[PDB]
Amino acid sequence: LPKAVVFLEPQWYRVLEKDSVTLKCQGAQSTQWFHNESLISSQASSYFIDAATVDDSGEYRCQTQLSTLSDPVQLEVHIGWLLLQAPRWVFKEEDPIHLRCHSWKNTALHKVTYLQNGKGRKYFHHNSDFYIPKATLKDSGSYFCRGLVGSKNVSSETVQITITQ
Amino acid sequence: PELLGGPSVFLFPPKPKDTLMISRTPEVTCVVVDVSHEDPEVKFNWYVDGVEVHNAKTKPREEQYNSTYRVVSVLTVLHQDWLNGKEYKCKVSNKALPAPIEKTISKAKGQPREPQVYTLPPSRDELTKNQVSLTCLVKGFYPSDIAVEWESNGQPENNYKTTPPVLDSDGSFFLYSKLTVDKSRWQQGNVFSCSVMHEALHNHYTQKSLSL
Amino acid sequence: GGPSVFLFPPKPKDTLMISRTPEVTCVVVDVSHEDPEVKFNWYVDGVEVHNAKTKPREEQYNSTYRVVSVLTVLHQDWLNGKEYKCKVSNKALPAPIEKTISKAKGQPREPQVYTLPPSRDELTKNQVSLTCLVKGFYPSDIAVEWESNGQPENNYKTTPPVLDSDGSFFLYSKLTVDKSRWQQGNVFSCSVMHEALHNHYTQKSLSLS
Ligand SMILES: *[C@@H]1O[C@H](CO)[C@@H](O[C@@H]2O[C@H](CO)[C@@H](O[C@@H]3O[C@H](CO[C@H]4O[C@H](CO)[C@@H](O)[C@H](O)[C@@H]4O[C@@H]4O[C@H](CO)[C@@H](O)[C@H](O)[C@H]4NC(C)=O)[C@@H](O[C@@H]4O[C@H](CO)[C@@H](O)[C@H](O)[C@H]4NC(C)=O)[C@H](O[C@H]4O[C@H](CO)[C@@H](O)[C@H](O)[C@@H]4O[C@@H]4O[C@H](CO)[C@@H](O)[C@H](O)[C@H]4NC(C)=O)[C@@H]3O)[C@H](O)[C@H]2NC(C)=O)[C@H](O)[C@H]1NC(C)=O
Ligand SMILES: *[C@H]1O[C@H](CO)[C@@H](O[C@@H]2O[C@H](CO)[C@@H](O[C@@H]3O[C@H](CO[C@H]4O[C@H](CO)[C@@H](O)[C@H](O)[C@@H]4O[C@@H]4O[C@H](CO)[C@@H](O)[C@H](O)[C@H]4NC(C)=O)[C@@H](O[C@@H]4O[C@H](CO)[C@@H](O)[C@H](O)[C@H]4NC(C)=O)[C@H](O[C@@H]4O[C@H](CO)[C@@H](O)[C@H](O)[C@@H]4O[C@@H]4O[C@H](CO)[C@@H](O)[C@H](O)[C@H]4NC(C)=O)[C@@H]3O)[C@H](O)[C@H]2NC(C)=O)[C@H](O)[C@H]1NC(C)=O
Ligand SMILES: *[C@@H]1O[C@H](CO)[C@@H](O[C@@H]2O[C@H](CO)[C@@H](O[C@@H]3O[C@H](CO[C@@H]4O[C@H](CO[C@@H]5O[C@H](CO)[C@@H](O)[C@H](O)[C@@H]5O)[C@@H](O)[C@H](O[C@@H]5O[C@H](CO)[C@@H](O)[C@H](O)[C@@H]5O)[C@@H]4O)[C@@H](O)[C@H](O[C@@H]4O[C@H](CO)[C@@H](O)[C@H](O)[C@@H]4O[C@H]4O[C@H](CO)[C@@H](O)[C@H](O)[C@@H]4O)[C@@H]3O)[C@H](O)[C@H]2NC(C)=O)[C@H](O)[C@H]1NC(C)=O
Ligand SMILES: *[C@@H]1O[C@H](CO)[C@@H](O[C@@H]2O[C@H](CO)[C@@H](O)[C@H](O)[C@H]2NC(C)=O)[C@H](O)[C@H]1NC(C)=O
C-alpha cells in the first residue's frame, strides 16, 4: 500500500491571490484530486491553479490507481500586497535561511525592509530575498517585510521563525 | 505614469456650514484617484455605523490631465446623523488593487466646548492710518469645525480674512478673523458684527458687536 | 530606488539675529549597508565651498544609515537670495542627487505691529487674552515672541501666516495671562522679527488703560 504524495511547485504553501500554483501527484497511472475532502474535475497528474483565489485555500489530497489516498497538503491563499514566504519555519544552527518578500502580481517593490521583532534587519533599494548564510540562535523571532509600491507604503503579515541548538 | 500601486482614496467630511444650517445639504465626498485606463471600473459601497446604504450619487469616470481617471462618489448625510457622531465608510473596489480600500470619516469625538467671541477695537497706533483692522477673536471651542462671517447693519462686509483654527494649549481651538475698513467709518462710529456658527452655540449661531 | 536627500533652510530667527548662526542642512536617508559611503559637495551661487561640517553616519532603527552635512551661512548671503546647493554622491545612485534652496523671492514688505487689550467681556474669565496683530509683511518668514519685564512669556500661541488680499501676510499672536497679572498693571511686550524691519526687530507694548 504506497501512499500518493502531493508536491507543491513552487514550494510555497502560502501564496497571494493571482499566484500560480502547480500541485503534482506523485504515485508509483490515472489521477483523482480532492479539495476540502471533495472531488474536483481534474484527472491530470498535475493540477494547475492559473490564478489563485481565496477559495482555492484548504486541503488537497490526490490518489492514483496504484496508490492509496495521500496525506493532506495545505494551501493558504492570502489577500494583500505582500507576503513573506519561507521554505520552513524551523531551522537548525548553521543552516541557510532564505526569506522572500513576495509582492502581489510580482509588482516592483522598492525601499524594502525585513524586520525582526520590530527592528530592521535588512534593507534593500530594490526587492531582494533576505539571506542568512548560517543561522544562529539569535535569528529566531517574529518577521515581516515592508516596502514601497510606487508611493504606497505596504506591509506583510508577521511570521514566526525558530532556530534550534 | 506607472501607477504601480493602483488607485488612492480620499474621504472628505462635509463643510462646517453645511452641517449647521438646515438650508444647506451636507455631503461626504469619496474621491478615487489614480484610476488607470486599463482597469477603469470602480465600485463603491457606502456604510453608516456599519450598515450599508444605497442612496449615494456616483459621477461618471472623469479623464484627468495626468492621464488617469478620477472618479467621485458623494453621499448626502442627514444633519443630526453627522452631529451625533456616526461613522461614514466608503469602500472602493478596483482590479488594480488586491483588496478593496476602506476609508472612515466621522465628526471629531470629544466634549463640544462653546466658543467665546470677542470683538476687539483697532489699536491706538492703527487709528492714525487710513484703514483700520477689526478683530474677532474666537476661542475655547471644540471641535474645530466653525464658520465666521462679518456684517454691518445686518448686511455682509466682505473685506475680511480668517485664520485656520489653532490648537490652543488648553486642548481647545481658537481663530482670529480680521475685517479691514476705512478709518472714518470707525471714528463715527458704524456698528459691525462678527457672527459665528458652531454646533455648541444655541441655535448654532451667535453674533458679537463692535463700535466706537 | 537609492537614498533620498532633503535640504532644509535655516531657522528664520537665525537669519535675522547677529548673535545667531544660520545653517543649511542636507540630510541623506535610506543609505544602504552595502553602499554606505556618502560624499557631499556644496555650492553657493554656483561656486563650490569647502567648509561644510559632515557628521558620522548614524544607523537608524530600520537598519539604514542617515548622514547629515551642515553648512554655516552668512546672514546677508541668505537674505540677498544666494542659492545653496547640496550635491550627494553614493554608489547606489547612477548620478548624484542635487538640491538647491534659497530665500523665497519677492519684494520685502515691512510688517506693522499692533497690540490689543482684552475685550471688556473677557474680564469675567480668570485668564485674559492679549493680542498681537502683525500685518503687511512679505515674505512670510517671521518670528513672534512675548516678554514681560525682561523675561520670556511662554503661554502664547501664534496663528500661521495668512495670505491677505494685497499679497502680503498677516498673523495674530495670542498670549494668555492670569487676569490678576493683567489687572496688576504689568507691561507686556510683543516682539517681532522680520527681514524688512529696521534692525530686523520691533517691540509693541500692552498695559492696563
Ligand atoms: C528609516 O528611518 C529614517 C529615520 O527615521 C527615515 O527617515 C525619514 O524619511 C522620510 C522620507 O521617507 C523623511 O521625510 C521627509 O520629512 C521632511 C520634513 O522633515 C522634517 O520634519 C520631520 C518631522 O515632521 C522630522 O522628522 C525631520 O527630522 C525633519 O526635521 C527637520 O530637520 C531639520 C534639520 O535636521 C531642521 O532644521 C528642521 O527644523 C526640522 N523640521 C521640523 C519641522 O522639525 C518633509 O519635507 C517637508 O514636508 C513639508 C510637508 O510635509 C513641506 O511643506 C516642506 O516644504 C518640506 N521640507 C523640505 C525641506 O523638503 C519631506 O516631505 C517632502 O518630500 C516628500 C517625498 O518624500 C513629499 O511627499 C513632500 O511633499 C515633501 O516634498 C518636498 O516639497 C518641497 C516643497 O514643499 C520641495 O522643495 C522638495 O523638493 C520636495 N521633496 C521631494 C519632492 O522629494 C519628507 O516627508 C524624514 O525626514 C526622515 N527622518 C529623519 C529623522 O531624517 C527613513 O525613511 C526610514 N527608511 C525606511 C526604508 O523605512
Ligand atoms: C494626477 O492628478 C490627480 C488630480 O488631478 C491627482 O490626484 C491628487 O492626488 C493627491 C495625492 O497624490 C491628493 O492629495 C490629497 O489632498 C488632500 C486635500 O484635498 C483637497 O484639497 C486640495 C487642495 O489642498 C484639492 O486639490 C483637492 O481637490 C481637495 O479639495 C477638497 O475636496 C473636497 C471634495 O471634493 C471638498 O469638500 C473640499 O472643500 C475641497 N477643498 C479643500 C481646500 O479642502 C490632502 O488633504 C488632507 O486631508 C485631511 C482630511 O481630509 C485634512 O485633515 C488635512 O488638513 C489635509 N492635509 C493638508 C491640507 O495638508 C490629502 O491628505 C494628506 O494625505 C497625505 C498622505 O496621502 C498626508 O501626507 C497628509 O498628512 C494628509 O493626510 C491626512 O492627514 C489628516 C490630518 O490629520 C488625517 O485626518 C487623514 O486621515 C490623513 N489622510 C491620509 C490619507 O493619510 C492629500 O494630500 C489630491 O487631493 C488629489 N487631487 C484631486 C483633485 O483629487 C493624482 O495624484 C495625479 N496622479 C499622478 C500619478 O501624478
Ligand atoms: C513605511 O511606513 C512605516 C510604518 O509607518 C514606517 O515605519 C516607521 O518609521 C518611522 C520613521 O523611522 C519610525 O519612527 C521612529 O521610530 C524609532 C522607534 O524605535 C524606538 O526605539 C527606541 C529605543 O531604541 C531601542 O531601545 C531598545 C530598548 O530601549 C533597545 O533594545 C534597542 O537596542 C534600541 O536601542 C524607543 O525608546 C522608542 O520608543 C519611543 O519612545 C517612547 C519610549 O518611552 C515610547 O513609549 C514610544 O512608543 C516611542 O515609540 C522607539 O520604540 C525611533 O528611534 C524614532 O525616534 C525619533 O524620531 C522621531 C521622528 O522621526 C522623533 O520624534 C524623536 O525625537 C526621535 O528622533 C531622534 O532621532 C533622529 C534621527 O533619526 C533625530 O533626527 C532627532 O533629532 C532625534 O535625536 C522614530 O520614532 C517608526 O517606528 C516606524 N514604524 C513602524 C511601525 O515600524 C516606514 O519608515 C515606511 N517604510 C518604508 C519601508 O519606507
Ligand atoms: C476549502 O476550505 C477552506 C477552509 O480552510 C476555505 O478557505 C476559506 O475560504 C473562505 C471564502 O472562500 C474565506 O472567507 C476564509 O477566510 C478561508 N479560510 C481559510 C482558513 O483559509 C476554502 O474556501 C474552501 N474552498 C472550497 C472550494 O470549498
**CA C192, CA C85: separation in Å to the nearest integer?**
30
Contact between A112 and A126 under an 8 Å Cβ cutoff? The reply is: yes
Q: Which experiment gave this structure?
A: X-ray
**CA A34, CA A142: separation in Å to the nearest integer?**
34
Radius of gyration of chain C (CA): 22
Query: How close is the Cα of B22 to the center of ligand 4, in Å?
Result: 49
A148 lines ligand 3 (CB under 6 A): yes
**CA B133, CA B209: separation in Å to the nearest integer?**
14
On chain C, the residues whose CB falls within 8 A of the CB of B120 are 116-117, 119, 131
**CA A73, CA A60: separation in Å to the nearest integer?**
5
On chain A, the residues whose CB falls within 8 A of the CB of B4 are 107-108, 149-150
Determine the CATH number of domain B107-212: 2.60.40.10
Contact between C77 and C169 under an 8 Å Cβ cutoff? The reply is: no
**CA C116, CA B127: separation in Å to the nearest integer?**
12
Cβ atoms within 10 Å, residue A50: 8
- Give the distance from residue A122's alpha carbon to the nearest chain C alpha carbon, in angstroms: 6
Of B3, B40, B34, nearest in space to A149 by CA: B3
| Ligand minimally distant from the alpha carbon of residue C4 | 1
Of A56, A86, A90, A50, nearest in space to A73 by CA: A56
**Would you mind telling me the total number of residues written for chain A in this entry?**
165
Q: How far is CA B111 from the centre of its chain?
A: 19
Cβ contacts of A156-160, under 8 Å, gap ≥ 24: A156/A80, A156/A81, A156/A82, A156/A83, A156/A84, A156/A101, A157/A78, A157/A80, A157/A83, A157/A84, A159/A84, A159/A86, A159/A89, A160/A89
| Right CATH for C3-102 from 3.40.50.300, 3.40.50.150, 3.40.50.2300, 2.60.40.10 | 2.60.40.10
**A9, β-bridge pairs:** A22
Helix (H) / strand (E) containing A47: strand A46-49
**CA C174, CA C128: separation in Å to the nearest integer?**
10
Nearest to B5 among A17, A18, A151 (CB): A151
C27 lines ligand 1 (CB under 6 A): yes
**A144, β-bridge pairs:** A115
- DSSP code at position C41: E
Q: Find where cell 501664534 sits.
A: C158
Cβ atoms within 10 Å, residue A38: 9
Contact between C142 and C12 under an 8 Å Cβ cutoff? The reply is: yes
Alpha helix segments (H runs only) across chain B: 16-20, 79-83, 183-186
Q: Which residues of C137-159 are buried (b: 16+ CB within 10 A; e: fewer)?
A: bbbbbbbbbbbbeeeebeebbbb
Contact C155 B174 (CB under 8 A): no
Q: What angle do CA B111, B116, B118 make, to 5 degrees?
A: 165
**CA B87, CA C106: separation in Å to the nearest integer?**
46
In a mutagenesis test of the B interface, which of A146, A152, A155 is the best target, namely the one with the most B β-carbons within 10 Å? A152
Contact between B58 and B73 under an 8 Å Cβ cutoff? The reply is: yes
B59 burial level (CB within 10 Å; 0-12, 13-18, 19+): exposed
User: Residue A151 CA: which ligand 2 atom is closest?
Assistant: 12
Q: Which three cell numbers stand for residue A43?
A: 484527472
| Right CATH for A81-165 from 3.60.15.10, 2.60.40.10, 2.30.40.10, 1.10.3720.10 | 2.60.40.10
Of C66, C94, C32, nearest in space to A112 by CA: C32
Q: Which of B33, B77, B92 to mutate to test the pocket of ligand 2 (most atoms within 8 A of CB)?
A: B33
C25 lines ligand 1 (CB under 6 A): yes
CB neighbour list of residue B3: distance below 8 Å, 6 or more residues apart: A150, B34, B36, B68, B96
> A96 preceded by cis ω (within 30°)?
no
Closest Cα to atom 83 of ligand 3? C62
Strands A90-92 and A159-164: parallel
Alpha helix segments (H runs only) across chain C: 12-16, 75-79, 179-183
**CA A132, CA A137: separation in Å to the nearest integer?**
12
Nearest to C32 among A119, A121, A123 (CB): A123
B115 burial level (CB within 10 Å; 0-12, 13-18, 19+): buried
Query: How close is the Cα of C5 to the center of ligand 1, in Å?
Result: 9
CATH homologous superfamily of A1-80? Immunoglobulins (2.60.40.10)
Closest Cα to atom 24 of ligand 4? A55
Q: Which residues of B192-207 are buried (b: 16+ CB within 10 A; e: fewer)?
A: bbbbbbbbbbeebebe
**CA A14, CA A84: separation in Å to the nearest integer?**
9
**Would you mind telling me the total number of residues written for chain B in this entry?**
212
Q: Does C131 touch chain B (CB under 8 A)?
A: yes
Query: How close is the Cα of C4 to the center of ligand 1, in Å?
Result: 10
Q: Do domains C3-102 and C103-208 have the same CATH topology?
A: yes
**CA B23, CA C18: separation in Å to the nearest integer?**
57
Where in chain A are the domains? 1-80, 81-165
Q: Which residues of C12-23 are buried (b: 16+ CB within 10 A; e: fewer)?
A: bbbbbbeeeebb
**A8, β-bridge pairs:** A23
Contact A119 C61 (CB under 8 A): yes
Residues 8-37 of B with CB under 8 A from C: none
Q: Which CATH fold topology does C103-208 show?
A: Immunoglobulin-like (2.60.40)
Q: Which residues of B122-133 are buried (b: 16+ CB within 10 A; e: fewer)?
A: bbeebeeeeebb
**CA C208, CA C181: separation in Å to the nearest integer?**
10
Strands A14-16 and A73-78: parallel
A153 lines ligand 3 (CB under 6 A): yes
Q: Does A17 touch chain B (CB under 8 A)?
A: yes
Q: Which three cell numbers stand for residue B142?
A: 471644540
**CA C36, CA C29: separation in Å to the nearest integer?**
11
Q: Does B92 touch chain C (CB under 8 A)?
A: no
Contact between C71 and C84 under an 8 Å Cβ cutoff? The reply is: yes
| Ligand minimally distant from the alpha carbon of residue B74 | 2
Q: Do domains A1-80 and A81-165 have the same CATH topology?
A: yes
Contact between B133 and C135 under an 8 Å Cβ cutoff? The reply is: yes
DSSP B5-37: T--EEEEEPPPHHHHH-TTS--EEEEEEEEE-S
Residue B59: phi and psi, rounded to 5, are: -70, 150
Of C75, C30, B175, B86, nearest in space to A110 by CA: C30
CB neighbour list of residue B185: distance below 8 Å, 6 or more residues apart: none
**CA C85, CA B20: separation in Å to the nearest integer?**
50
E-strand stretches of C17-168: 23-31, 39-44, 47-49, 53-54, 58-59, 65-72, 84-89, 97-101, 112-116, 127-137, 143-148, 151-153, 156-158, 162-163
DSSP C170-186: EEEEEEEEEHHHHHTT-
**CA B38, CA B94: separation in Å to the nearest integer?**
11
To what resolution in angstroms was this structure determined? Answer: 2.4
Q: Which CATH fold topology does B7-106 show?
A: Immunoglobulin-like (2.60.40)
Where in chain C are the domains? 3-102, 103-208
Of B137, B127, B120, B123, nearest in space to B173 by CA: B137
Return the partners of chain C (3 or more C-beta pairs < 8 Å).
A, B
CA A46, A52, A58, A63: dihedral to nearest 10 degrees? -10
**CA B30, CA B42: separation in Å to the nearest integer?**
12
